[PDB]
RNA sequence: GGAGGUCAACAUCAAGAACUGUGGGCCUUUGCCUAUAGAACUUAUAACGAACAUGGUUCUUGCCUUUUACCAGAAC
RNA sequence: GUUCGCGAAGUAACCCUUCGUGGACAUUUGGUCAAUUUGAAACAAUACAGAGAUGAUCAGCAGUUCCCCUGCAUAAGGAUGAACCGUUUUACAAAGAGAUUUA
RNA sequence: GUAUGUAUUUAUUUU
């Protein structure tokens, strides 16, 4: 459908002006899944319309709490450890593409040139052991009976060590504040009145 | 095909979403190519998504980098007031924005702590919550614009159009139901026949009654039948309180 | 004669049934997949002998429904069976008026 | 409501010999071929694997109004071409009956939607050259008999035919109300 | 399509002086922009009397009309233009001048001015 | 039958040969939703097919003749289809059996399977009507001959005579000297409208005579469809045609009417 | 037969601190009183969502030539 | 093509292979639509014209219409959106005076 | 807030 001149396209046009109702649910849809930076690539389920009028992305992320601060949380120290490192640290322009150069396609220039490691982070050896593992998997933990539902992927179930790991890695998202009585004045009620 | 399908040929759409004029433009163009805040915003919000589409893009290739990247959406996400113009569309989103950059605030002085100024960033959690979620509000709004601009567009405007009165047309109106009043009742004292010629004629008499009580003068008529003075009287004194 | 009781009850049960078809078929006319949450064969052709079967097709969502509908006037004629005959029951007047 | 509640007008012809027809019902289809107005759509298939596919044209109106069929376009009745029935009746009687129709648009935006009904509607190298040719028979009819019997020019205005065999040869078999001779060099 | 319009796409190579070049040269074949006259939309300052059916153009009128620039050259250099103007009542054209010495206008062909 | 229905239809045109879309430059930018070009009209755009049929020598059997399907390729009656005996539809001059089969249906829609409208068009365009059985097709512009000079007009009507002649049975042809115009007259609307799409936009003369190698450049030969005869003689022979037809038809009426009794 | 599924349909999810069925008595089915069985999910710093958007009407403002687009509070 | 089975043949000792046959499993897609001239986009260019009430130059609101356009719009614009600005004769009589014809 | 309007027929419809 990229070039479409003929006759046989005018349902397909039609077809189009159509869709444009429904796109930004599909602008909605993809930019909610969006990689993170810890991950390299996402696969997505895409539905399309049969003339290739439009592609939604149909998923919802689900991410374990705990090990989603834990996640973010590490990737905040490799940021930090980052920037304190190296000299040169140089921001990529704005837009990235000029007007004229229509969007490469996919099929052709990306799909061959392989991911270009990500952020991570080197973790530990001794005492992430429990959770050095499976951290940065796209979904963390998808096969196993005892710690997750299935691949459906909703009411996870943990252990003792790992919340433990879990807890000593998103010290610095944590909320840190360990008691109610600190919140006095700052409670919703005070807010309200 | 939106573009064209109005007819419009020489409005070209680049490949961020610009949509400039190729030709200076005769006035009836301007007249038929101005195009709402349907189209314009949704342009606005798609040259968005290419935008970010195409840092990952650039990931992709292997042309930036690992840290680049992040520190890049999150540029984005904070200035898109800078990078877009939908602020213009609809204001409304400029609380987003004000949004998006308090975090930014709040995100650097709990990172940047003990060291640099420099530009190193890229934790895009909030910003991408925030206009993710203005992104749910206006999902129903877009789809009642765009539905009327796409039915509108095969199916012509609604022929009827009706228009309510409002600050404007007011006074109109007003004069309208009174100069009808008028004709009623003083059609119907009548005793039979005669009625246009009468009628323009008495609702003149009104007329020149109301400019005469503006003007303070007495406005009597040599003759006329003084039940229709008793009318007109009526009315004119009713429209002066 | 006032007109009883049961025979409200008659007029208000056919009457209401009536205006809620009218309100339902427009509900689901309309552009909103979210109004449409407040909402046989039939056909015996000359003498029958083929029969007949209708069923509905499924719209492609994105193509216009309605393929048909567009907005244009209509003159009617007005069609008089009958006349309606206009039974009603000056000279110096217009010296005064 | 107005639209779906009259019933479609099917012939038993073009229906088809099938005992149980499946048939496509759209609540708005494209205007008719003649009032121009919307109206509800049904497809058919004749066979249950027929290739074909028969769309009704007209309205329900547009129609009973002429009253024809809405895919054949012919007499409800008798099965004959409209501009037809009007002339077999307008031979009774003496000069009536034409069906005077509609140009412009609301014309016949218009004009389908009284309920008056219409007219017809109401009651229910070798060169022989040929002379001596009526000016009525067409070439067809000619060269059709010759065939019967056992490449041709004719001018109308002159009343005269020259026809050209594939061979002499024909020409002694054929040989075997008309000017012939036989001459060509 | 906005009435204020900062930027015009152009088309991806448009070298703009070699655009100047050509469309120079384009500039001689065209009817319009060679046809030594002009149309303006104006108002007659000093009234006016018509000398076909005699009609007066009141005071000051608005008028489609026609300038001209005069192959005349007001001292050594100064413009000066001629005017024309068409009667509403008949289809006659009257001409002005343009007197930078005097400031005042002064007229010809067709119309006559009142005192 | 030894012709046509034994040997298989033949590819008229490889599909890469085919021309293109986007008729060339008609104005100043090219449009995406219609086709068509923008802003400004250039000369009005017709040209000459490059392509025409060769009755005996393309037309073969299909795959709608084992499927008994009832429509005819324009393609071929352009001779442009690219399917060849891959195509759905038939590919062959109609003749008097499928118009049989074809009787039915051929009242509301063409040969071609495309409904017809009611007005004919402003300018008696491509299809025609479905109110009147019109048989007569209007040929004009012969300057699709282009500018060659003739030395007689039996040149121009046997030169057509032997055009149209293979598409079908011809009534009557009359050429007119006067106003450059052919009347062409068949048994049967089908071979009209057939014969109306094949034949339009077309040169003329030999496979090589004089200019033939420029014949690309020519304009192309309206084929309309034609008003009514003014004259009184052929006005006489359609009311007599008109007449005589009813009485036929009104055994029919007598022949099941008697049958209801 | 067990485990599952980024599968579907149909129910139900804001209230007398509140659900349903059943036994018995009175009025004459409803309703009141009495007896008994079972109550998934959501609720007390109150709620299905440990999150957080937009729109309509009506008022109060704020910008202030006018309308969209808006400024920040309330009710529905 | 799988599986249950029967029969024949062969290897075999009821098993392995081939052949023949019975039965089960599986059961009617798609089109309102065919691929450039001849079933219908609209601007632009050229020529002519040249602006509402007025003596004149402007703000504007409406109202009617089988005109609509831009607009998400029931907001508001499009010259106050445009058209309007023209053609115009019979419910018809009563009274009086003069000329012509007639029982 | 840069009007607006009219016209732009080339391909020849039977006497
Ligand atoms: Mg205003
Ligand atoms: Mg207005
Ligand atoms: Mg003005
Ligand atoms: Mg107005
Ligand atoms: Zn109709
Ligand atoms: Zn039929
Ligand atoms: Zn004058
Ligand atoms: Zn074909």
Redesign the pocket.
Known sequence: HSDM????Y??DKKAFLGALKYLPHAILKLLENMPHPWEQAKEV?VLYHTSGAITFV?????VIEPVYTAQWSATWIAMRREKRDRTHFKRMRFPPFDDDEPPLSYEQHIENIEPLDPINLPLDSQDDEYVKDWLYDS?PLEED?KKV??????KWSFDLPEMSNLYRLSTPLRDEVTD?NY?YLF???SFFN | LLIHR??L??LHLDYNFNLKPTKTL??????????????HLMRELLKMMKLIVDTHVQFRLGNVDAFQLADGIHYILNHIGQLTGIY?????????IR?CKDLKHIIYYKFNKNLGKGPGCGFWQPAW??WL??????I??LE??????IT??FE????E????T????????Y??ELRNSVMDDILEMMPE?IRQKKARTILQHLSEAWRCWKANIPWDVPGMPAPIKKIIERYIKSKAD | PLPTKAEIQECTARTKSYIQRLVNAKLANSNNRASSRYVAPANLLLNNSHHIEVVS?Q??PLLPRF??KKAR?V?APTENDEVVPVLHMGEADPNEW | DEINEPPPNICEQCLGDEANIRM?K?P???ECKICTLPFT?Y?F?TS??????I?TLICVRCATQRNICQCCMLDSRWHIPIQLRDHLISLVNEENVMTEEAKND?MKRFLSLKNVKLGGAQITTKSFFLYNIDASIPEWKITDTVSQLLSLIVNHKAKCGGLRFQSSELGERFVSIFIIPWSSG | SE?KAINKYYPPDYNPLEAEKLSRKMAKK???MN?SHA?I?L?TPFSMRCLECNE?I???????GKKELLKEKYLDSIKIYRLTI?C?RC?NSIAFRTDPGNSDYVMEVGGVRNY | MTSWRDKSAKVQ?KESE??S?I?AQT??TF?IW????????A?????????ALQPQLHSGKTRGDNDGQL??????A?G????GPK???LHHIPDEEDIGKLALRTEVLDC???E??????????????FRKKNK?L?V????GALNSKHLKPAQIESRIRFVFSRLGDIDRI?Y?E????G?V?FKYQANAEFA??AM??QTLLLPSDKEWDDRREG????????????????QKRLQEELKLESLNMMVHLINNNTNSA
Not at chain 1, 149 to 154: D, I, L, P, Q, V
Not at chain 2, 161 to 164: E, G, H, P, R, S
Not at chain 6, 34 to 41: L, M, P, R, T, V
């Open positions: 001149a003929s006759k046989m005018n349902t389920k149909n998923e919802t992320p689900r979904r009976s539902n299935g691949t459906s992927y909703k109610k919140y409670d919703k009620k | 109005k007819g040929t020489y005769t006035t009836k163009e301007r007249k038929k190519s101005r195009l709402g805040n349907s189209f213009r569309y609809k204001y409304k989103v400029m609380h987003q949004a919550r925030v979620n203005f992104l749910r509000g206006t129903p709004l009642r614009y765009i539905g009327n601009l509108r567009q012509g405007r609604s022929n159009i009706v228009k309510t409002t600050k404007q047309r007011l006074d109109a109106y004069d309208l026949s | 097709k719209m492609d393929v048909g006037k003159v | 496509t759209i708005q289809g494209s759509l497809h298939k249950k694997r027929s290739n074909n596919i769309k609301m | 009435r065209l009817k319009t046809k149309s939309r108002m007066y009141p005071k000051s009128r608005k008028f489609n068409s509403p289809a | 045109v085919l021309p879309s008729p104005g100043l449009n219609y086709n068509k070009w923008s802003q400004g009209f000369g009005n755009t017709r040209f000459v097919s490059p392509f429509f005819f390729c324009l393609f071929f352009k442009m289809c690219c399917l195509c759905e539809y071609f399977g495309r017809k409208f009611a007005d004919y068009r402003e300018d008696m365009g491509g299809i025609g009507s007569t209007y004009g512009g012969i300057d009359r007119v006067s106003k450059n115009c009347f007259k109306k799409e339009s936009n304009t192309g030969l309206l084929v309309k469809w034609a008003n009514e005869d003014p004259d009184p003689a052929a």
